[PDB]
Coordinates of C-alpha atoms and ligand atoms in Angstrom, one line a residue:
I1 CA -73.5 59.1 11.0
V2 CA -71.4 55.8 11.6
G3 CA -73.1 52.7 12.8
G4 CA -76.5 53.9 12.4
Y5 CA -79.8 52.9 10.0
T6 CA -81.5 54.3 7.1
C7 CA -84.1 56.6 8.9
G8 CA -86.9 56.0 6.2
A9 CA -88.0 58.7 3.9
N10 CA -89.2 62.2 5.4
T11 CA -89.5 60.2 8.8
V12 CA -87.3 62.9 10.5
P13 CA -89.6 65.9 9.2
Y14 CA -87.6 68.5 10.7
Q15 CA -84.0 67.7 9.2
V16 CA -83.0 70.1 6.6
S17 CA -79.9 69.9 4.4
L18 CA -77.7 73.0 4.1
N19 CA -76.7 73.4 0.3
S20 CA -74.2 75.8 -1.5
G21 CA -74.3 73.9 -4.4
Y22 CA -74.0 70.5 -2.5
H23 CA -74.9 69.4 1.0
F24 CA -72.4 70.8 3.5
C25 CA -74.3 70.5 6.8
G26 CA -77.7 69.8 8.8
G27 CA -79.9 71.9 10.4
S28 CA -83.4 71.7 12.3
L29 CA -86.4 73.6 11.3
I30 CA -88.0 75.3 14.4
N31 CA -90.6 77.1 12.9
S32 CA -92.0 77.9 9.3
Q33 CA -89.3 80.6 8.7
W34 CA -86.0 79.6 10.8
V35 CA -83.8 76.9 11.0
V36 CA -81.1 75.8 13.6
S37 CA -77.6 74.9 12.6
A38 CA -73.8 75.2 13.9
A39 CA -71.9 78.3 13.8
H40 CA -69.1 76.3 12.3
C41 CA -71.7 76.0 9.6
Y42 CA -71.9 79.5 8.6
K43 CA -71.5 80.5 5.0
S44 CA -73.1 82.9 2.5
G45 CA -75.2 81.7 -0.3
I46 CA -77.0 78.9 1.7
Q47 CA -80.3 77.3 0.1
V48 CA -82.1 75.5 2.5
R49 CA -83.5 72.2 1.5
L50 CA -86.4 70.6 3.4
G51 CA -88.3 67.5 3.0
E52 CA -85.2 65.6 1.6
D53 CA -84.5 62.3 1.8
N54 CA -82.1 61.1 -1.1
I55 CA -80.3 64.6 -1.4
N56 CA -79.4 63.6 -5.0
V57 CA -82.7 63.0 -6.3
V58 CA -85.9 65.1 -6.6
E59 CA -88.5 62.5 -4.9
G60 CA -91.4 64.9 -4.8
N61 CA -91.6 66.5 -1.0
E62 CA -88.9 68.8 -1.2
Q63 CA -88.9 72.7 -0.5
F64 CA -86.1 74.6 -1.5
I65 CA -86.1 77.8 0.1
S66 CA -82.8 80.6 -0.1
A67 CA -81.9 81.9 3.6
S68 CA -82.7 85.9 3.7
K69 CA -80.2 86.2 6.6
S70 CA -77.8 84.1 9.1
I71 CA -77.1 84.9 12.5
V72 CA -74.1 83.4 14.1
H73 CA -74.3 83.3 17.9
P74 CA -72.8 86.7 19.4
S75 CA -70.3 84.5 21.5
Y76 CA -69.6 81.9 19.2
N77 CA -65.6 81.2 19.3
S78 CA -64.4 79.1 16.4
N79 CA -61.3 77.8 18.1
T80 CA -62.8 76.3 21.0
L81 CA -66.4 75.8 19.5
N82 CA -68.1 77.3 22.4
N83 CA -71.3 78.6 21.7
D84 CA -71.7 76.6 18.4
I85 CA -75.1 77.5 17.2
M86 CA -76.5 80.0 14.5
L87 CA -80.0 80.8 13.3
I88 CA -80.9 80.9 9.8
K89 CA -84.1 82.7 8.2
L90 CA -85.7 81.4 5.2
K91 CA -86.7 83.9 2.6
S92 CA -90.1 82.7 2.4
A93 CA -92.3 80.3 5.0
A94 CA -92.2 76.8 4.5
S95 CA -95.4 75.0 4.2
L96 CA -95.9 73.0 6.9
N97 CA -97.5 69.3 6.7
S98 CA -96.6 65.6 7.9
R99 CA -92.9 65.3 6.0
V100 CA -92.0 69.0 6.7
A101 CA -92.6 70.1 10.5
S102 CA -90.6 72.1 13.1
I103 CA -89.2 70.6 16.1
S104 CA -89.9 71.9 19.9
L105 CA -87.5 73.6 21.5
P106 CA -86.5 72.2 25.0
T107 CA -88.0 74.0 28.0
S108 CA -85.6 72.4 30.4
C109 CA -82.2 70.8 29.6
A110 CA -82.0 66.9 29.3
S111 CA -80.0 64.6 31.3
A112 CA -77.4 61.8 31.0
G113 CA -79.1 58.4 30.3
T114 CA -81.9 60.0 28.0
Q115 CA -82.0 58.5 24.4
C116 CA -82.1 61.0 21.8
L117 CA -82.1 60.4 17.9
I118 CA -79.1 61.9 15.7
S119 CA -79.4 62.1 11.8
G120 CA -77.6 63.4 9.1
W121 CA -76.1 62.7 5.6
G122 CA -72.6 62.9 7.1
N123 CA -69.7 60.1 6.3
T124 CA -71.0 56.5 7.4
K125 CA -67.0 55.2 7.8
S126 CA -64.8 55.6 10.9
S127 CA -61.7 54.9 9.0
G128 CA -62.5 55.6 5.4
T129 CA -65.0 57.8 3.6
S130 CA -68.4 57.0 2.3
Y131 CA -71.1 59.6 2.0
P132 CA -74.8 58.4 1.8
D133 CA -77.6 59.8 -0.2
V134 CA -80.3 59.0 2.3
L135 CA -80.6 60.4 5.6
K136 CA -79.1 57.8 8.5
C137 CA -80.3 57.9 12.0
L138 CA -78.7 56.9 15.4
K139 CA -80.2 56.3 18.6
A140 CA -77.9 57.1 21.2
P141 CA -77.9 58.1 25.2
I142 CA -76.7 61.5 26.6
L143 CA -73.6 60.9 28.4
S144 CA -72.7 62.0 31.9
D145 CA -70.8 65.5 32.1
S146 CA -68.1 64.1 34.1
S147 CA -67.4 61.2 31.4
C148 CA -67.7 64.0 28.6
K149 CA -65.0 65.9 30.5
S150 CA -62.9 62.9 31.2
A151 CA -63.0 62.2 27.4
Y152 CA -61.8 65.6 26.6
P153 CA -59.8 67.3 29.2
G154 CA -59.9 71.1 29.2
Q155 CA -62.7 71.1 25.9
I156 CA -65.7 70.7 27.5
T157 CA -67.8 74.0 28.7
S158 CA -71.2 74.2 30.0
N159 CA -72.8 74.8 26.4
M160 CA -71.6 71.2 25.3
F161 CA -72.5 67.8 26.1
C162 CA -71.6 64.1 24.9
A163 CA -73.8 61.7 23.4
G164 CA -73.0 58.3 22.1
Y165 CA -71.1 55.1 23.1
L166 CA -67.5 55.1 24.8
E167 CA -67.0 51.7 23.1
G168 CA -67.1 53.4 19.8
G169 CA -68.5 52.2 16.7
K170 CA -71.6 54.8 16.7
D171 CA -71.4 58.4 16.2
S172 CA -72.2 61.3 14.1
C173 CA -69.3 62.4 12.0
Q174 CA -68.2 65.0 9.2
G175 CA -71.3 66.2 7.1
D176 CA -73.8 65.7 10.1
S177 CA -72.6 68.8 11.3
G178 CA -75.2 71.4 12.5
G179 CA -78.1 68.4 12.4
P180 CA -80.5 67.6 15.1
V181 CA -80.1 65.5 18.4
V182 CA -83.6 65.4 19.5
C183 CA -84.7 63.8 22.9
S184 CA -88.2 62.9 24.1
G185 CA -89.4 65.3 21.0
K186 CA -87.4 68.3 21.9
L187 CA -84.0 69.7 20.1
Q188 CA -81.6 69.2 22.8
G189 CA -78.4 69.5 20.5
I190 CA -76.6 70.2 17.5
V191 CA -74.0 68.2 15.8
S192 CA -71.0 70.3 16.7
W193 CA -67.6 68.3 16.8
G194 CA -65.5 65.3 18.2
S195 CA -62.3 63.7 17.7
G196 CA -62.5 61.5 14.6
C197 CA -65.9 59.2 14.3
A198 CA -67.0 56.6 16.4
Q199 CA -63.4 56.1 18.1
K200 CA -63.2 54.7 21.2
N201 CA -63.4 57.1 24.2
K202 CA -64.2 60.0 22.1
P203 CA -67.9 60.3 21.8
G204 CA -69.7 63.0 19.9
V205 CA -69.9 66.5 21.3
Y206 CA -73.0 68.6 20.7
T207 CA -74.1 72.0 21.5
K208 CA -76.3 72.3 24.4
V209 CA -79.5 74.0 23.0
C210 CA -81.6 74.5 26.2
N211 CA -78.8 77.1 27.0
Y212 CA -79.9 79.3 24.1
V213 CA -83.9 78.7 24.1
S214 CA -84.0 82.7 25.3
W215 CA -81.7 84.2 22.8
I216 CA -83.2 82.0 20.1
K217 CA -86.6 83.1 20.9
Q218 CA -85.8 86.9 21.4
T219 CA -83.6 87.0 18.0
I220 CA -86.9 85.3 16.1
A221 CA -89.1 88.0 18.1
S222 CA -86.8 90.9 16.4
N223 CA -86.1 89.6 13.0
Ligands
H06_301 N1 -67.7 62.3 16.5 C1 -68.5 63.3 16.0 N2 -69.5 63.1 16.6 C2 -67.8 64.3 15.0 C3 -66.7 64.6 14.5 C4 -66.4 65.4 13.6 C5 -67.7 66.3 13.3 C6 -66.8 67.6 11.9 N3 -66.2 67.1 11.1 N4 -65.9 67.8 10.3 C7 -64.7 67.9 9.4 O1 -63.9 66.8 9.7 C8 -64.2 68.7 8.6 C9 -65.3 69.9 8.1 C10 -65.0 70.7 7.0 C11 -63.4 71.0 6.8 N5 -62.7 70.0 6.9 C12 -62.9 69.1 8.2 C13 -68.5 66.3 13.4 C14 -69.1 65.5 14.5
CA302 CA1 -84.3 64.6 -2.7

């Protein structure tokens, strides 16, 4: 997260870190046994780390649970990043409390202008590279589909939306991938892609979660 702020320990209780010997992506806990992330985060040997603040220090509220299975969206295209969504099932149910909690799925899509909270342990610099240890947060508005398409001609599908600031300076970034965009208490987005980070006229692009609620529910129901 570039141009954001320190969230505060466990203030984002649905935020997970996907770990394969090191943090490599974010994710969102959607019930005691399932995490939503980006398909581009797919890999084998994932351990899901819940209740994290400092990802380099055991602070007392963590739950580390191995993934038992991953399901990349059936229509994920790694070249276009269309349908950039994946489900991860935990080997055991997380113990849910104030600091480890699921986030509600949307029942309708969000509109341009809605404010959202975007969070992660990704790069904090738009030019250089600095990775934080504690969770970073950014409040950002959803942008109109027309401005999103104008920013990224030929690249924005009906399964994507832009959020952030066309002036630059405030954005998600590398390492935030797969993490949450939460708007009025609902998971509306997943950190997906962008050209650089916090660049002028290049806002963040997010997977449009409301399009996938049907697939998520039915997938969970049979797995
Ligand atoms: N501007 C955003 N909101 C944004 C931009 C980019 C990303 C993702 N980056 N990932 C990388 O660079 C990368 C990752 C692994 C290997 N090689 C390169 C997320 C958000
Ligand atoms: Ca920790």
